[PDB]
Amino acid sequence: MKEFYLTVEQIGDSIFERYIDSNGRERTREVEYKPSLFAHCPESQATKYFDIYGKPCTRKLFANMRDASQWIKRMEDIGLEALGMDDFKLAYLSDTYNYEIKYDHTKIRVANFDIEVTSPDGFPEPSQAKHPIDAITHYDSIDDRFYVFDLLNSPYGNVEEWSIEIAAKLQEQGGDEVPSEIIDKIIYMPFDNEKELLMEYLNFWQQKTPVILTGWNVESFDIPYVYNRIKNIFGESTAKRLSPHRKTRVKVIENMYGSREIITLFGISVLDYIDLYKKFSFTNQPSYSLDYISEFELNVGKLKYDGPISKLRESNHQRYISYNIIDVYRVLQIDAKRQFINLSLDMGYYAKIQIQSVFSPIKTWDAIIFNSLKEQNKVIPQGRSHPVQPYPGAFVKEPIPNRYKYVMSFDLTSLYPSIIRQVNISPETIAGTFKVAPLHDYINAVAERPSDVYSCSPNGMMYYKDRDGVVPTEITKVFNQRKEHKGYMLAAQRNGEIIKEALHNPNLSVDEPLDVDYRFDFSDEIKEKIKKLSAKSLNEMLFRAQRTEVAGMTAQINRKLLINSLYGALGNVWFRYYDLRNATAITTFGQMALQWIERKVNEYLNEVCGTEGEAFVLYGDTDSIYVSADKIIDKVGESKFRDTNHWVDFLDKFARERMEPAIDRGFREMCEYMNNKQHLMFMDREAIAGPPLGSKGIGGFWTGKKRYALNVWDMEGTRYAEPKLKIMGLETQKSSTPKAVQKALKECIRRMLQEGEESLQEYFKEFEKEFRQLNYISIASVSSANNIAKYDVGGFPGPKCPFHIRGILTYNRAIKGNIDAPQVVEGEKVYVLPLREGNPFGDKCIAWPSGTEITDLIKDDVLHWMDYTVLLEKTFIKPLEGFTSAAKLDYEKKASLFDMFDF
Ligand SMILES: Nc1nc2c(ncn2[C@@H]2O[C@H](CO)[C@@H](O)[C@H]2O)c(=O)[nH]1
């Protein structure tokens, strides 16, 4: 069993690391690393070791690790360049784990927990943790259990224990609806006081010390709290014990907050699931409240409770404690389906880097290359910060606002990376520079062709078309691995169908499982010996395949990420290999290909249609384009098409046979113009959208850059049952808009695109009427009280103050008299509502903590007072209003000359 690390940390001149040994055991060792470095040597020498420039260098041994540090410091002082890997941890690894990796994972203590503290005012301050923690669920991958610590006594409330069984009941049985398959897997243990509680957890912890720490807002919240709190009632010395190496660092961060600390646990890789999500999600989202994502991801939703989230323990310790768990579980379920954590291992294991350093492309990439060069005997430069220069980003066409019946998209796969390789961009690949003409001309080819020996970029760059550039080759390497691992998972998946049915009537005596490398489809030789096998003898056969297809595919994705998070690191100042000219080269080229191909399209097209000065390319954005099929369709007339679906196939064959061809062909021309290394410019149709045929719906409309919506039918081949709406930046999303409204708007658009104005017009009257009977909450407007509520407490408000904070102060001036039942607003997420003027409150609008109902004393009044008309305008009419205008429509029909007359 070939070993591997877990956590590596550097303190003093010695490393400290947790790893599994040649026979599955998690141990530690404190190794005093003897770092190796380099410096350019006088040319005439004999050596391996030469930088990525030609220049030769010579090894430097430090024995003591911090000598190096003293050395480098020095060199730079003198003015001499110091080469090698400054981050020792990544260096260490490189040597010790020199081979390909192969990690177990079932062997890695991934702890997922979540604490709960009950605070008067719904939010507490992790900063000092004035209050006690009254709940803690702590899952253990290694154990498959959930450890639950409950505090029964508290100045905020002394409660009864919790019922395993009641939790085990259905809603109607006052049950917590808790999932069976978990139930037996709990280990509840209640306490009398906080000390005993923690103290134990501490011990619990010091015993089952995590490698990976997860949660939801675990980093920002849970983790700090703990730490602080402990130190508070126990003191630091003992708080420190939370780290295996019992060492630790506190870090403050800033912004629209101020103190936001993130404790850095020495020797445990912390991966807040939240971040970890946002990165690999590949799905932009509007809010990340746990229960929102669990909805989308598992449909389920969240444990519905009553009263504030601060009341709950007092008002119902039962559910308070159940939910706590559910949370942890929800996450579990997600990792298990999306598999993120697993991925990370793999990834961080691939690049041989500290696991959490997955959140940093710099870190990763750097390490990837470093290791690449290592077994190549070259030497990485020395990083050296440059300043922050505003090179442009990608292009985004200003679109004409209007309705657009038939339309179709196209995507340059990856793009940036492809560019890099299309132009052999890398730092040592930089050959020259040319007199640079205004880009505009270049895209029209009215510029003169620069260099005939060099690969060139529109910002005046020139690159050696010979030498195979570091960056470019390095990426290709990755790209092959994906092309390769993608196939792998296919073979063993499709090699699973093989064992799938030859196990429906398996049995032939009792067999011995076969030595198969599933990675490739079988062979008929092998295929015959399979039918000669039984369900017993097979099955481990079918587990490995379906699982090597699991496994293998994980990596295929891994690359997908890397490949995608590359430009992140290059466009980054701190990235060792960063260079502005390089960076700019990219974005500019990219910026070009877009309008280049955009022009080309139009040409070709209004030519093939034989129309004139007709701009078809309706909009483009970073790496996609939009073409108005409108006139193409009309050429052949709407009449012929007998099925909305009928034409859909049409555009498709067109794209694929007329279009596509012209593109590649037209991109070749560009590559040509640049004397580029190769052709890597692949853009393929990707979406088709429009009104159902016969339907007076408009198919789609735009409002401005990134402000658009449309009726999709085929999503890259995959045709659609009924349509599926693609909204973009239209506040259907923006958290702020009330739910009831969103669900509404979302609908108007559907009507528009699919049905026609009549349909819309009537619906308008609908929700309009029903507006006044809707439950207030579905109509309230959310927005964060980004705690600058402070800045306005001039007793009362004071101009240059927004609606939000206005509503909050006016609120608190009503909550003067608590009864304690009324929560107060602690710097986060609130409600907001109009109020007709001359209300007995002062100000016009109130807001209250999100998720909550309102203290009854004021409650009934508020709403009686509530401003309906206003609310509506601001919330619904206004945004809607926009749409219409852009798409050129009307929500209320023009006051006919013909009214008064009943027909
Ligand atoms: N080839 C190479 N080795 C390096 C570099 N930086 C540090 N080393 C270390 O020097 C030793 C010999 O390669 C190994 O321990 C490397 O991990 C670098 O930039 N290139």
Task: State in Å: Cα 23 to ligand 1 middle.
Answer: 29
Task: State in Å: Cα 475 to ligand 1 middle.
Answer: 21
The CATH architecture that domain 383-468+573-729 belongs to is: Alpha-Beta Complex (3.90)
Query: For residues 562 and 516, is the Cβ–Cβ distance under 8 A?
Result: no
CATH top class, domain 1-106+340-382: alpha beta
Query: For residues 153 and 168, is the Cβ–Cβ distance under 8 A?
Result: no
Separation CA 179–CA 164 (nearest Å): 11
Determined by: X-ray
Task: State in Å: Cα 60 to ligand 1 middle.
Answer: 10
Residue among 94, 95, 98 to mutate when testing ligand 1 (max atoms within 8 A of CB): 94
Task: State in Å: Cα 139 to ligand 1 middle.
Answer: 40
Beta-carbon neighbour count of residue 356 at 10 Å?
Answer: 22
Phi first, then psi, for residue 711 (nearest 5°) are -85, 90
Output the residue whose Cα is nearest ligand 1's atom 2: 374
Output the residue whose Cα is nearest ligand 1's atom 3: 374
- Length reported for the chain: 903
Known binding positions for substrate: 414-416, 482, 560
The CATH architecture that domain 782-865 belongs to is: 3-Layer(aba) Sandwich (3.40)
* Residue 11 in tokens: 């303190």
Task: State in Å: Cα 49 to ligand 1 middle.
Answer: 9
Q: Which residues contact 353 (CB under 8 A, 6 or more apart)?
A: 90, 93, 363, 364, 367
Beta-carbon neighbour count of residue 874 at 10 Å?
Answer: 14
Q: How far apart are the first and last CA of the chain?
A: 87
Task: State in Å: Cα 469 to ligand 1 middle.
Answer: 20
Known binding positions for Mg(2+): 114, 116, 222, 327, 411-412, 623
**Which CATH number is 469-572 given?**
1.10.287.690
Fold adopted by 730-781+866-888 = Monooxygenase (1.20.1280)
Q: Which residues contact 874 (CB under 8 A, 6 or more apart)?
A: none
Q: Which residues contact 894 (CB under 8 A, 6 or more apart)?
A: none
Task: State in Å: Cα 84 to ligand 1 middle.
Answer: 6
Domain boundaries, the chain: 1-106+340-382, 107-339, 383-468+573-729, 469-572, 730-781+866-888, 782-865
Q: Which residues contact 441 (CB under 8 A, 6 or more apart)?
A: 447
> What resolution in angstroms does the PDB record give?
3.2
**Which CATH number is 107-339 given?**
3.30.420.10
Give the CA dihedral 677, 395, 276, 254, nearest 10 degrees.
Answer: 120
Output the residue whose Cα is nearest ligand 1's atom 11: 36
Separation CA 897–CA 349 (nearest Å): 74
Separation CA 251–CA 247 (nearest Å): 14
Q: Quickly tell me which residue has 């691995």 as its tokens.
A: 481
For residue 94, which atom of ligand 1 is closest to its CA? 17
CA 214 to chain centre: 16
Query: For residues 617 and 666, is the Cβ–Cβ distance under 8 A?
Result: no
Output the residue whose Cα is nearest ligand 1's atom 17: 91
CA 836 to chain centre: 42
Give the CA dihedral 277, 279, 283, 287, nearest 10 degrees.
Answer: 60
Which residues line the pocket of ligand 1, CB cutoff 6 A? 36, 83-85, 91, 94-95, 370, 373-374, 377, 379-380
Separation CA 699–CA 405 (nearest Å): 5
Taking alpha carbons only, the member of 878, 879, 881, 876 closest to residue 739 is 876
Known binding positions: 114, 116, 222, 327, 411-412, 414-416, 482, 560, 623
For residue 376, which atom of ligand 1 is closest to its CA? 1
Output the residue whose Cα is nearest ligand 1's atom 4: 84
